[PDB]
Design a protein around this ligand. Structure first.
Ligand SMILES: [Mg+2]
Ligand SMILES: [Zn+2]
Ligand SMILES: [Zn+2]
Lengths: 99, 78, 32, 149, 258, 59, 115, 66, 100, 49, 179, 59, 28, 446, 59, 179
RNA sequence: UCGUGCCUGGUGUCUUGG
């Protein structure tokens, strides 16, 4: 992945040129593109096996992950750095530390 | 100027039925004719269809406001 | 003792039944 | 009355697609007088037919000659004289599709009436006028009988 | 609107099994009689075991369980006894039970075959099957081991415990040739012929018979020795007839009381 | 219980079929499970590419 | 531990009725017979005998649960015929059959035996 | 442990047939004729004698006394 | 339900469809309000179902394909709305728990 | 505490056993063994009813 | 089974209620056919087939893995000498009605195992049993008269339900109530 | 009540002849552990008869 | 003699003797 | 009081994976130590009865019972919000039996219909007019199955055997094969039922039934299906034997011929690469193009032999009947039983050179042939060669391995998801917020 | 700091479990291992190690 | 060698004489790397188009690859390999007579099956596991049928009349200690 | 002629269950 040196090339579609690495998408195309691309990635890993998940849930996770502007990770380095409040945080991971 | 849904949510329905059934079990005055049953949930359900549950639902809005809805006011779903 | 007698007088049948090797339901490898 | 259709037919094939079920076979037929095409499943087990057999097929709305339009439930215990007493093969079903050569402007000349005798399908097909008796979701009876000629 | 009129034909009669043919009856009647032979004919069997001394290599209930399964000669006596649950006695009565007794001590050097010989009855008729061929092995005892128990036999039927089932195996059959097509063969020639098949060796199954009922039910009732194989039958007919009579009584009460 | 006949094993109230190979420790039968390990004294070569090393030989 | 005692398949409790007639409401001239402490032995012969009755529109039997010892017999007749009397007849004549079968078996025995 | 009293499947008494069966194997018989000579027609009852492992013979070696 | 018989000519004015769909579109409310910011969002939120609604309830399909009577069409409209309103996301629902 | 005794607890009025299929129940029924039923209780308010 | 075919006893019928062959050979165990096709335990069928041969020939059969003098045609031809269907199928009468089953049932002797997992060592139930000394919740275990855990995964499933009174009951009132 | 812990025989009803021990008793009923089955049953106290288990001659 | 086609008999005799000499737990 | 017949309980199989893993049930008391379930409730619980255990919780209040009754009760749970499809379907011998029950040639007499109607809950008590009256009153599969179908449903589905080229040709509305399921006015008109119509698929007949009718009437529909059909299955029966595993001695010849051709094909690929004529199929090394060709050949071989296995099976076959009902198994399961097992892979490749340049000691150094790298050429009926027994084990070990690791990793991902989105809910504003009142979505799902 | 579970209680449930517990091998590789290459059935277990007898758990 | 070894016990000959005569050889896994190994004496050492024609060793019986619990499976080669694994595991849970002197044992848990049977279809290698002396299971007349639903999903329907006759009856011994 | 009642174990590890 590099994306920006790629997009810039002549005879290369700067419209339809996707990147798979959601972090490159955050740095190059910005948060609202991450949201779209993250859903596309997450929909690919779901529907690959032929199964179907309703759009609500995919929209919703990608919404929560992209709600504070920065890409918000589903781990302690993300969800506990969010200003949620201590009794929420301590249930998840880091229990003593956040209290 | 009530802005909320005019329909009784499944969650409202659950706790209103549950709540009213509790009151019933505690020797509350019934607001409906008993055709000869004894279950407080059965009673509560009957009352619900009659729109006779003496309960208003205080729905909290995210800003901090609220709207009160009588049971007879909103549209029962099931 | 009779199982020794039985098993030797039986397994010689795989040498005696020489005329009809035809039936399908069994296979074996033949490499290179 | 209530005679929605009648003609003699002959068995042109017993199951030309190849026998798909053991007790049931796809009769293909043409009619003698109205020159209707027919496809008809029959219980080939309880009522066998060969190629070149002729049968009088009377598609009826009711069973009773006076046309008193019975209800649609089974009652074996019944004195009233029926149409079934002069037939060999009698079935009950719904016309579930009617289809035709309609254009955008003008009417149809040919209809296919499709009926299901509880699963045993039939397509009777030809002149729209000879098929004017049929209407979709109406109930119907088969009333066929082999001609020994 | 009424009953059909069945005919019977005994084909084979031994002191071990009966082969009979029932004609002109319903499939339901012909099978319900089969159910009754298995589960609803009464016999006498050990059902109460009081173990005084047990030093064998087996458990306590193992002995008692094996005693339960020993068949007892029932024919003359079983239609006289009360069911235990129906006798007025505070414990057991000769009108509601037969008392048994086992007292065995291995004193000798050789092993002791505790057989049904050792079960001593108080009634001369309700014995284990020894009359007229070895005996049911209960245990094997070593030098110094013993077994003292007393046991009682009561009336019961196979619906409770298999111990009261009078039959070895009931061989029910109808329509030997596939005339009804009640069964549908994928390859009808891969199938061996029935015992009863009125068919040549050319054709595989009988031609399809559209309008036709089962009749001619073929039975082979095999006794466990607890009754004669022909008494199992008279008893089952009487048992089923008695359930229906009882049913009718209860019915008549229900009718008049509504 | 070694080189000992079926008669003797029965007289000791012990099984002739019992394989052996276990310890009695406070009246508990204990087995030592055969723990596997890399063979001693034998050189091996691997690629721990996740390091300063392209290859590591081991002994 | 939880097992029903085995006598529970045929023995009537205290208060339990053998047989129980219920007028069905969904069609005219229909009843539901509820037999207690019975199974497929008694329920099948009655059903099959009822099917012989020309005046009987419907007859059937069910076992609501094989762990619970009870059968249901639903009978529907013609308006000139109660299912009460249908049910009565199908026991009466079925007893007449089994009695005639018992008699005929007996003679067949005594003929087999030296004959 | 010890030969069942009845064929579990059908219910025929096989309890009396084990000594006899071993006796017919003191004679030079195939098990197939031993089972037949005892009269076991069904393939249920025939399994009881084929498949019975006689462990009471081994339990008898553990004398209590003498 | 109404026994249509799609082989007779129908009595359903091609304009009752055009105007009944317009009046139906009104009753399918997600974003309540008369504000332009609220009307816009109401319009947006129900855009795809409205397209669909307007694409199956034509004047031509209603007359060349479905053959709906007038009574059947009034039934239909009531049905559509009655169903849509039941499909509304219930307040109180823990959607993130479902999403997870 | 938080995972072992708060966000998840042990609870009264609960049972467990082997499951077996039973086609004669409705989809909304669970058949329960007599001693589970005779063990667990439901507090039921007394009423003239 | 000897093939990987585990299962619980789902009901017990008496010999009057079991299906039966042209003689009164009821099954001892009936297993649902749906166990075979996905699992591809063909060895079970073969065993059930050879066991049938073994019982009738009256000599114990040989199931060595890689034998090749054994196959299914050979067993089948043996089976057919005893008056059975060559494929091991039989014609069962239904035990309730007595009517022949329209399908020919595959039936024969197979070796079955009782596993140690009896239900009466797994059945458990609680209401106001003993309490842990440290945190006043139910004990763990069947023997300690413990309570079931309403874990996190269960907790998520009630949030998703919106059953918040039940959530607080399982998590407060039916667990460790205090003031 | 006096007979709690005593050996009784069920003398009437479906369980005729079953021995057990009284685990609990009331003014009208008792709980009896049956000697045979793995089960304790509740029964009308009049259905029971005391058997006892004693030895004489104590010398 | 170097050519027995009696082998599914001969084979299990060497098996039996292996197992007569060395038990199953010989390795312990 | 004790728990009693008609009580509410909420009932669970761990691991709880989705909302449908805990559901409210009505209690019924029964005389033996197991819990009992209706089997359509297996599918949501992912249960087995293979020694599975389930937890029961009894609510303890009027306020909590009512809550479960109104939010969690099994029939309320039919359609999951996950995929907008039923979670519960007809999934075992009822499904197998229903295919067989709805066939065209299924005829019932008065004695069997009236016996079958006893097992309806929703019956109006009237016997439908039999599809054949003369020469003898005979009902149909569809006609009795028409009483089970509640209300006035309308739907269309395709049965699993449906030929693609049917909808084009004639006989479209009159299928020769009795494929094309049609329900009108809540009556089965055409078609055999299977997983495609009675399963857990969007717009399956159990889905339409739930969208159309209540949740309550849908509850009676599953229960009727099982009760009627299981009862019919006492007549029809179902089984699977040896006989259902034999081909027809012509198929054996076709398979052997195919196999030999395959073995032959691979030898020329080996010759070409051994004499340097196998040119690297663009986007590949030499050693990759080879492996591709081989696997193609072999996969082709398996597919071809699988096809002649299917084509050989009689309509009376019992594997087929469980595959075309969708009850249990797949067409590859028949292939593996009758014709060929196939290629045994570990890590997506063929069997590796575990020994020095060979797979086993029996083989020879540098042996890429089909037998030498895991290609099982026998069937489960014929048995496996010793070598290919081993290879089969090697492959089947992969599944066991992946199982044990998949359970540990996924369970942590599910936890993290729930914790990062536990407080997300639909406020009365009809907006999607979190614990902070921060707006997530303006409308749920846009 | 030690190795653990090396000694184990002999499994007296059935003869086949006795016999099989005595011939058991164990791997030193820790749990909490995401690696498969030690859990895989190696070509070279042929005739040495049963290719069938393994625990279905995490082991 | 077969003649001397068939007449063992009646003369002193044994497995060690095959070793000492240079007939059979213990080969290590690390030396098995270098063997050119046949799988049957005859079938691999005949004359065709050549595979190797340089065989160094032969297998004794290919069924010796199996272990203790796996060697009791009849026809393991007709099974899906995970199935054999499952059986391998469940075979260690099978009730039987667990050891011959069990009535002297005070083991904390034990199960003795009442009427254990020898398999009707055995492997040749289950002789040496002494399985026919100490068996864990019963030959049951299995049917494979969808009888009345109660077996439907890994379940089985058992005969009550067979269970009454002691089919799969067992003793569970529990043992207690105190000092 | 009599009137007293909830005691009550913690810690680790291997085996095995879905
Ligand atoms: Mg499971
Ligand atoms: Zn008495
Ligand atoms: Zn038998």
């Amino acid at each position: 992945v590099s994306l920006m040196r790629v997009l810039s090339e002549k005879d290369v579609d700067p419209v339809r040129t996707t990147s798979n690495d959601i972090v490159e998408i955050f740095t190059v195309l910005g948060i609202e593109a991450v949201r779209k691309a993250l859903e596309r990635e997450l929909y690919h890993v779901i529907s690959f096996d032929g199964s179907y998940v309703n759009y609500r849930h995919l929209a919703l996770l990608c919404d929560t992950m992209t709600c504070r502007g920065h890409l918000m990770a589903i781990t302690r380095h993300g969800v506990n750095r969010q200003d949620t409040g201590p009794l929420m945080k301590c249930s998840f991971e880091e229990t003593v530390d956040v209290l | 100027k009530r802005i909320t849904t005019p329909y009784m949510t499944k969650y409202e329905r659950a706790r209103v039925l549950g709540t009213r059934a509790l009151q019933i079990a505690m020797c509350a005055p019934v607001m409906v004719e008993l055709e000869g049953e004894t279950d407080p949930l059965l009673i509560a359900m009957k009352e619900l269809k009659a729109r006779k549950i003496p309960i208003i639902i205080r729905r909290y809005l995210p800003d901090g406001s609220y709207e009160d809805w009588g049971v007879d006011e909103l549209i029962i779903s099931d | 003792e009779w199982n020794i007698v039985e098993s030797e007088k039986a397994l010689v049948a795989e040498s005696h039944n020489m005329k009809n090797q035809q039936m399908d339901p069994f296979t074996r490898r033949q490499c290179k | 009355a209530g005679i929605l259709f009648e003609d003699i037919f002959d068995v042109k094939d017993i199951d030309p697609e190849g026998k798909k079920f053991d007790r049931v076979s796809r009769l293909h037929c043409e009619s003698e007088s109205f020159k209707m095409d027919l496809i008809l499943d029959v219980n080939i087990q309880i009522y066998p037919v060969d190629l070149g057999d002729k049968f009088r097929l009377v598609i009826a709305s009711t069973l009773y000659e006076d046309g008193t339009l019975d209800d649609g439930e089974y009652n074996p215990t019944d004195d009233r004289p029926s149409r079934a007493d002069q037939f060999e093969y009698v079935m009950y079903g719904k016309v579930y599709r009617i289809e035709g050569d309609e254009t955008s402007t003008e009417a149809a000349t040919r209809l296919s009436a499709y009926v299901s005798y509880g699963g045993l399908l039939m397509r009777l097909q030809g002149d729209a006028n000879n098929l004017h008796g049929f209407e979709v979701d109406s109930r119907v009876y088969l009333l066929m009988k082999k001609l020994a000629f | 609107p009424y009953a059909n009129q069945p005919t019977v034909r005994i084909t084979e009669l031994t002191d071990e099994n009966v082969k009979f043919i029932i004609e002109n009856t319903d499939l339901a009647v012909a099978n319900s009689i089969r159910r009754v032979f298995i589960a609803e004919v009464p016999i006498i069997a050990i059902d109460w075991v009081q173990i005084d001394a047990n030093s064998s290599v087996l458990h306590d209930e193992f002995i008692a369980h094996r005693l339960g399964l020993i068949p007892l000669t029932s024919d003359d006596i079983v239609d006289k006894l009360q069911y235990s649950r129906d006798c007025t006695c505070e414990e057991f009565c000769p009108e509601c039970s037969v008392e048994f007794t086992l007292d065995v001590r291995c004193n000798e050097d050789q092993t002791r075959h505790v057989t049904s010989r050792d079960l001593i009855s108080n009634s001369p008729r309700v014995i284990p099957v020894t009359s007229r061929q070895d005996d049911i092995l209960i245990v094997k005892l070593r030098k110094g081991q013993e077994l003292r128990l007393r046991a009682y036999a009561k009336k019961g039927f196979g619906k409770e415990h298999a111990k009261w089932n009078p039959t070895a195996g009931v061989a029910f059959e109808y329509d030997p040739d596939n005339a009804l097509r009640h069964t549908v063969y994928p390859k009808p020639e891969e199938w061996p012929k029935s015992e009863y098949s009125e068919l040549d060796e050319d054709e595989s199954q009988a031609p399809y018979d559209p309008n036709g009922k089962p009749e001619r039910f073929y039975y082979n009732v095999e006794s466990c020795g607890s009754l004669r194989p022909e008494t199992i039958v008279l008893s089952a007919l009487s048992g089923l007839k008695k359930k229906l009579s009882d049913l009718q009584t209860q019915l008549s009460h229900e009718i008049q009381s509504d | 219980l070694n080189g000992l006949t079926d008669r003797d094993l029965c007289e000791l109230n012990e099984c002739p079929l019992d394989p052996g190979g276990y310890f009695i420790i406070n009246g508990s039968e204990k087995v030592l499970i055969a723990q596997e390990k890399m063979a001693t004294n034998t050189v091996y070569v691997f690629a721990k590419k996740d390091s300063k090393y392209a290859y590591t030989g081991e002994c | 531990m939880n097992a029903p005692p085995a006598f529970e398949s045929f023995l009537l409790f205290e208060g339990e009725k053998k047989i129980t007639i219920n007028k069905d409401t969904k069609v005219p001239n229909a009843c539901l017979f509820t037999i207690n402490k019975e199974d497929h032995t008694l329920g099948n012969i009655i059903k099959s005998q009822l099917l012989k009755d020309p005046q009987v529109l419907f007859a059937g039997y069910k076992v609501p649960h094989p762990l619970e010892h009870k059968i249901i017999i639903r009978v529907q007749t013609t308006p000139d015929y109660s299912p009460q009397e249908a049910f009565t007849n199908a026991i009466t004549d079925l007893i007449s059959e089994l009695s005639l079968l018992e008699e005929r078996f007996r003679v067949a025995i005594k003929d087999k035996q030296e004959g | 442990m010890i030969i069942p009293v009845r064929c579990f499947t059908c219910g025929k008494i096989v309890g009396n047939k084990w000594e006899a069966y071993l006796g017919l194997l003191q004679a030079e018989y195939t098990e197939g004729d031993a089972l037949d000579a005892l009269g076991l027609k069904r393939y249920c009852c025939r399994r009881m004698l084929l498949a019975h492992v006689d462990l009471i013979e081994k339990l008898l070696n553990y004398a209590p006394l003498e | 339900i109404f026994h249509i018989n799609p082989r007779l000519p129908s009595d359903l004015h091609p304009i009752k469809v055009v105007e009944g769909v317009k009046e139906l579109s009104k009753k399918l409310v997600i974003v309540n309000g008369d504000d332009p910011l609220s009307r816009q969002a109401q319009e947006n939120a129900t855009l795809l179902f409205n397209i669909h609604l307007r694409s199956t309830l034509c004047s031509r399909r209603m007359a060349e394909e479905f053959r709906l009577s007038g009574e059947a069409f009034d039934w239909l409209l009531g049905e559509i709305e009655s169903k849509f309103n039941q499909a509304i996301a219930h307040p109180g629902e823990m959607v993130g728990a479902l999403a997870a | 505490r938080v995972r072992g005794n708060l966000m998840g607890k042990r609870v009264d009025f609960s049972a467990r056993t082997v499951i077996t299929p039973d086609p004669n129940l409705s989809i909304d029924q669970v058949g329960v063994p007599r001693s589970i039923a005779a063990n667990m209780t439901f507090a039921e308010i007394v009423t003239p009813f | 089974s000897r093939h990987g075919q585990k299962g619980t006893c789902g009901i017990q019928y008496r010999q009057e209620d079991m299906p039966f062959t042209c003689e009164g050979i009821t099954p001892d165990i009936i297993i649902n056919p749906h166990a075979i096709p996905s699992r591809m335990t063909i060895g079970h069928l073969i065993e059930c087939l050879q066991g049938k041969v073994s019982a009738n020939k009256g000599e114990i059969g040989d199931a060595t893995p890689f034998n090749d003098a054994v196959n299914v045609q050979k067993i089948s031809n043996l089976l057919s000498d005893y008056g059975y269907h060559l494929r091991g199928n039989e014609v069962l009468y239904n035990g309730f009605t007595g009517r022949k089953i329209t399908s020919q049932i595959f039936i024969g002797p197979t070796y079955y195992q009782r596993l140690k997992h009896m239900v009466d060592d797994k059945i458990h139930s609680r209401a106001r049993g003993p309490i842990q000394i440290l945190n006043r919740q139910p004990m763990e275990g069947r023997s300690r008269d413990g309570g079931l855990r309403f874990g996190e995964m269960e907790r998520d499933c009630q949030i998703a339900h919106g059953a918040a009174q039940f959530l607080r009951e399982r998590l407060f009132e039916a667990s460790d109530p205090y003031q | 009540n006096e007979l709690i812990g005593q050996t009784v025989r069920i003398s009437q009803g479906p369980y005729k002849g079953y021995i057990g021990v009284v685990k609990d008793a009331t003014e009208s009923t008792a709980r009896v552990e049956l000697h045979s089955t793995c089960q304790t049953i509740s029964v009308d106290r009049q259905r029971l008869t005391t058997v006892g288990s004693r030895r004489p001659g104590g010398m | 003699e170097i050519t027995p086609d009696l082998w599914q008999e001969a084979c299990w005799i060497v098996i039996s003797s292996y197992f007569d000499e060395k038990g199953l737990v010989r390795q312990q | 009081r004790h728990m009693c017949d008609g009580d509410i309980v909420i009932f669970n199989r761990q691991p709880t994976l989705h909302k449908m893993s805990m559901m409210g049930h009505r209690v019924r008391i029964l005389p033996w130590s197991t819990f009992r379930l209706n089997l359509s409730v297996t599918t949501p619980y992912n249960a087995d009865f293979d020694g599975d255990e389930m937890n029961l919780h009894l609510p303890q209040s009027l306020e909590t019972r009512a809550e479960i009754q109104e939010l969690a009760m099994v029939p309320r749970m039919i359609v999951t919000p996950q995929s907008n499809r039923p979670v519960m379907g007809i999934v075992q011998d009822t499904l197998t039996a229903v295919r067989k029950f709805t066939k065209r040639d299924v005829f019932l007499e008065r004695g069997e219909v009236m016996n079958l109607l006893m097992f309806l809950s929703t019956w109006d008590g009237k016997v439908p007019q039999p599809a054949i009256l003369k020469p003898r009153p005979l009902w149909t599969g569809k006609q009795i199955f028409s009483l089970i179908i509640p209300g006035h449903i309308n739907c269309i589905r395709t049965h699993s055997t449906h030929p693609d080229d049917e909808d084009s040709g004639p006989y479209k509305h009159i299928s020769p094969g009795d494929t094309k399921v049609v329900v009108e006015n809540g009556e089965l008109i055409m078609g055999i039922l299977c997983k495609k119509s009675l399963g857990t698929s969007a717009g399956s007949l159990v889905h339409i039934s739930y969208l159309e009718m209540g949740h309550d009437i849908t509850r009676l529909f599953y229960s009727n299906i099982q009760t009627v059909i299981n009862n019919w299955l006492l007549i029809e029966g179902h089984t699977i034997g040896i006989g259902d595993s034999i081909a027809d001695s012509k198929t054996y010849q076709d398979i052997q011929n195919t196999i030999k051709k395959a073995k032959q094909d691979v030898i020329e690929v080996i010759e070409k690469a051994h004499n340097n004529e196998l040119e690297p199929t663009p986007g590949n090394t030499l050693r990759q193009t080879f492996e591709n060709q081989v696997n193609r050949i072999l996969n082709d071989a398996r597919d071809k032999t699988g096809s002649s296995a299917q084509k050989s099976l009689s309509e009376y076959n019992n594997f087929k009947s469980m595959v075309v009902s969708g009850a249990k198994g797949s067409k590859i399961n028949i292939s593996q039983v009758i014709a060929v097992v196939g290629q045994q892979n570990v890590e997506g490749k063929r069997i590796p050179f575990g020994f020095k340049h060979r797979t086993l000691p029996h083989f020879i150094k540098d042996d890429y042939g089909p037998e030498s790298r895991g290609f099982v050429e026998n069937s489960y009926l014929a048995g496996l060669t010793p070598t290919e027994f081993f290879f089969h084990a090697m492959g089947g070990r992969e599944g066991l391995i992946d199982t044990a690791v998949k359970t540990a990793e996924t369970g942590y991902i599910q936890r993290r998801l729930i914790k990062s989105m536990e407080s997300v809910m639909v406020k009365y504003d009809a907006t999607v917020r979190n614990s902070i009142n921060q707006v997530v979505q303006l409308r749920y799902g846009e | 700091q030690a190795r653990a579970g090396v000694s184990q209680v002999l499994n007296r449930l059935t003869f086949a479990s006795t016999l099989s517990h005595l011939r058991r091998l164990n791997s030193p590789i820790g749990r909490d291992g995401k690696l498969a290459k030690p859990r895989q059935l190696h070509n070279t277990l042929w005739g040495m190690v049963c290719p069938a007898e393994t625990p279905e758990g995490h082991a | 060698h077969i003649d001397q070894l068939k007449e063992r016990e009646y003369n002193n000959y044994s497995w060690q004489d095959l070793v000492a005569s240079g007939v059979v050889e213990y080969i290590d896994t690390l030396e098995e790397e270098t063997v050119m190994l046949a799988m049957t004496p005859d079938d691999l050492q005949e004359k065709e188009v050549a595979y190797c024609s340089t065989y160094t060793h032969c297998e004794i019986h290919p069924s010796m690859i199996l272990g203790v619990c796996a060697s009791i499976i009849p026809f393991p080669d007709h099974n899906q390999s995970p199935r054999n694994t499952y059986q391998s595991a469940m075979g260690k849970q099978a009730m039987g007579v667990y050891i011959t002197n069990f009535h002297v044992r005070m083991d904390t848990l034990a199960h003795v099956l009442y009427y254990p049977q020898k398999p009707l279809v055995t492997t040749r290698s289950m002789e040496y596991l002494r399985f026919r002396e100490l068996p864990a299971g019963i030959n049951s007349i299995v049917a494979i049928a969808s009888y009345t639903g109660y077996n439907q999903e890994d379940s089985v329907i058992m005969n009550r009349s067979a269970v009454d006759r002691g089919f799969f009856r067992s003793v569970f011994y529990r043992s207690y200690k105190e000092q």
